[PDB]
Write a protein that binds this ligand. Sequence first.
Ligand SMILES: Cc1ccc(-n2nc(C(C)(C)C)cc2NC(=O)Nc2cccc(Nc3ccc4c(c3)CCCCC4=O)c2)cc1
Ligand SMILES: CCCCCCCCO[C@@H]1O[C@H](CO)[C@@H](O)[C@H](O)[C@H]1O
Ligand SMILES: CCCCCCCCO[C@@H]1O[C@H](CO)[C@@H](O)[C@H](O)[C@H]1O
Length: 331
Amino acid sequence: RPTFYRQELNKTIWEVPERYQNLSPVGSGAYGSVCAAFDTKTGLRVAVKKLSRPFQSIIHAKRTYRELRLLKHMKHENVIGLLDVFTPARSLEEFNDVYLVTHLMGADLNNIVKCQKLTDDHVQFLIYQILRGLKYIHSADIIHRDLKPSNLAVNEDCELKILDFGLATRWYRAPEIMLNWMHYNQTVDIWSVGCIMAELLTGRTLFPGTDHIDQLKLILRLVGTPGAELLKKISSESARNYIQSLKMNFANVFIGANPLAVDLLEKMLVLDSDKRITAAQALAHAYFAQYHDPDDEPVADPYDQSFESRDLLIDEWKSLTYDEVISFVPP
Ligand SMILES: Cc1ccc(-n2nc(C(C)(C)C)cc2NC(=O)Nc2cccc(Nc3ccc4c(c3)CCCCC4=O)c2)cc1
Ligand SMILES: CCCCCCCCO[C@@H]1O[C@H](CO)[C@@H](O)[C@H](O)[C@H]1O
Ligand SMILES: CCCCCCCCO[C@@H]1O[C@H](CO)[C@@H](O)[C@H](O)[C@H]1O
C-alpha cells in the first residue's frame, strides 16, 4: 500500500499516492474532475480523474463502475488505458472515492490543430490512429458516442489516444445520436471521425451548428436528404415530411484534398449509419496505405457488458467497483 497525501484540488480533498506529483486541474464537472500530474514512480505524465460522489446514487455508482470497467478493459495504444486506480479507503465500508489514472498525452486534438489546416500526411496519421483505436473499442462492442477533438489526446509525436473527458460539444455528434434514435451502430463514431477528419483537412468545423436543428440542417445540406433506402428505416411519415424541409458531391468543402481522403470522408459521412464504413474497413482504405498494417490493428478481448442491462442497488455497484479497484494490476 502506498502512502497517500492530501491536497485541496478542484474544490475537494484529493487523497492520492505520493508517487503522483504536480497535480494541476485540467477539467472539472458534475461527474468528477481531472488533474494533470507526474507519476514519479513511472516517470510518466498522467491524468488523475477523481470521481465526484461516485456512490451517491445508483446512477453515480453504476457510472463509476462503468468507467472503471471500461478503462480496465482498454489495452490499446490508441485508446486511453488505466495506469492506476486507487482509493484512500482501506475497506469496502470506508470506500467512497475512486481515482483513475491514465497517460496524459499532453494536449487534445484542438491544441495541435489550433484551427489550422493539417497536412494530408498528418491527417492520415491522426485519423489512422483514431480508426485503429475505434476498431479496438468497437471490437469490444463499445460505442464511444461522443468522439470529438477534445476527446483525442495527442503527445508531441502526435501519437494519439481516444478517451472520454466528459465530466462545439454537438458538432461531431452522429445525427442519429442527436435524434435520440436509440439503436446505435458503432458507426455513430465513424460519423464523428468524418467530422474530425474534415476539420483536420479544411481547418474548419464541418458542421458548426448553432443548435440542435441547425446542426441537422447543416448535415442535410451537405450529405443530402435521406435516400429511399434510409427513408424506409424511418417509421414516422411526419418525421420524414419534417426532414423534407431541408446529396451534394463531396467536392466543394474538400477542395484540394487528397481524392483518397475525400473518398474516405464520403464513406464516413453517410447519413445511413448502416452504410457508413466501419473502423476496420476504413483502416484498409487506400488513404491509410502508409500506415495500415492488418497485423497491427488489434481487437479487444471480449468485454463483459452484462452490467449495462442491470438495475442494481448502490451497495452492489459500490462493492462491484471496489472489487475492480482491489483486483487492479498495473500494465
Ligand atoms: C462514465 C464514463 C464512462 C466511460 C468513460 N470513458 N470511456 C472511455 C472510452 C474507452 C474511450 C470509451 C474512456 C472513458 N473515460 C476516460 O477517458 N476517463 C478519463 C480518465 C482519466 C483522465 C481523463 N481525462 C484526460 C486524460 C488525458 C488527457 C486529457 C484528459 C485532457 C487533455 C490533456 C491531455 C490528455 O492526455 C479521462 C468516461 C465516462
Ligand atoms: C438529419 C436528419 C436525418 C438523420 C437520420 C440518420 C439515420 C441514421 O442511420 C440509422 O441509424 C439507426 C440507429 O443506429 C439505424 O437503426 C438505422 O438503420 C440507420 O439507418
Ligand atoms: C429534424 C429532422 C429529423 C426528423 C426525425 C427523424 C426520425 C427518427 O426518429 C427515430 O426513427 C426510428 C423509426 O424508424 C425509431 O426507431 C426511433 O425511435 C425514432 O427516434
